[PDB]
């Protein structure tokens, strides 16, 4: 059972290259790379990956990496993001973001909050930030309207789902370059989170998530003024 998400939308990937499932020998080679890649051997490993993972397998690889690895292996987010960067394909990156958005959509749209694995949610949110904001690439307003999503979640009593999704994404702006405060978009979201902290009468763990986020930017609650949307 699902609920509508007014302020979250997934677009289709534009692609002229026919997509196929990877054959057993390609899967074997790809898994070998993923299981043995380190910061030290990254460049050579990506060279090896390119010989096997041709563009007709980009959708397969994105679905695989996001659903089988990124969703459950937060310690490898930085490394996997570096692999995607090294591959040098905009199309691959688009598929990676697309699958991530679709997976996030399913979780955020699940009506029963007890049926949402909170760690999977936080992992996918952090991963999204890793392959967008942390690479100085935006998350488009047409896909996620963050301020509207937060205000709607307040109205619909969904902050326990939406807040950690927002904070785990936004923390990835902390070393960005483009998206660190005083970036007004980033700061705007922080100001609304501070307002909600004051007004929502929410669970302690949400206060914790906001505190952790502010700290990542070397900011405190006292350093910002709350918005007044609520």
Curated annotation (Swiss-Prot):
| Coiled-coil features, chain-numbered ranges | 36-54
Tell me the domain of life: Eukaryota
Could you list the residue ranges that cross the membrane?
none
Q: Which organism is it from?
A: Saccharomyces cerevisiae (strain ATCC 204508 / S288c)
Q: Where in the cell is it found?
A: Cytoplasm; Nucleus
Function of the protein: Acts as a component of the CCR4-NOT core complex, which in the nucleus seems to be a general transcription factor, and in the cytoplasm the major mRNA deadenylase involved in mRNA turnover. The NOT protein subcomplex negatively regulates the basal and activated transcription of many genes. Preferentially affects TC-type TATA element-dependent transcription. Could directly or indirectly inhibit component(s) of the general transcription machinery.
| Protein family membership | Belongs to the CNOT1 family.
Quote the record's miscellaneous comment: Present with 4300 molecules/cell in log phase SD medium.
- Subunit structure as annotated in this protein's UniProt entry: Forms a NOT protein complex that comprises NOT1, NOT2, NOT3, NOT4 and NOT5. Subunit of the 1.0 MDa CCR4-NOT core complex that contains CCR4, CAF1, NOT1, NOT2, NOT3, NOT4, NOT5, CAF40 and CAF130. In the complex interacts with CCR4, POP2, NOT2, NOT4 and NOT5. The core complex probably is part of a less characterized 1.9 MDa CCR4-NOT complex.
Name of the featured protein: General negative regulator of transcription subunit 1
Counting on the full-length protein, the chain here runs from: 760 to 989 of 2108
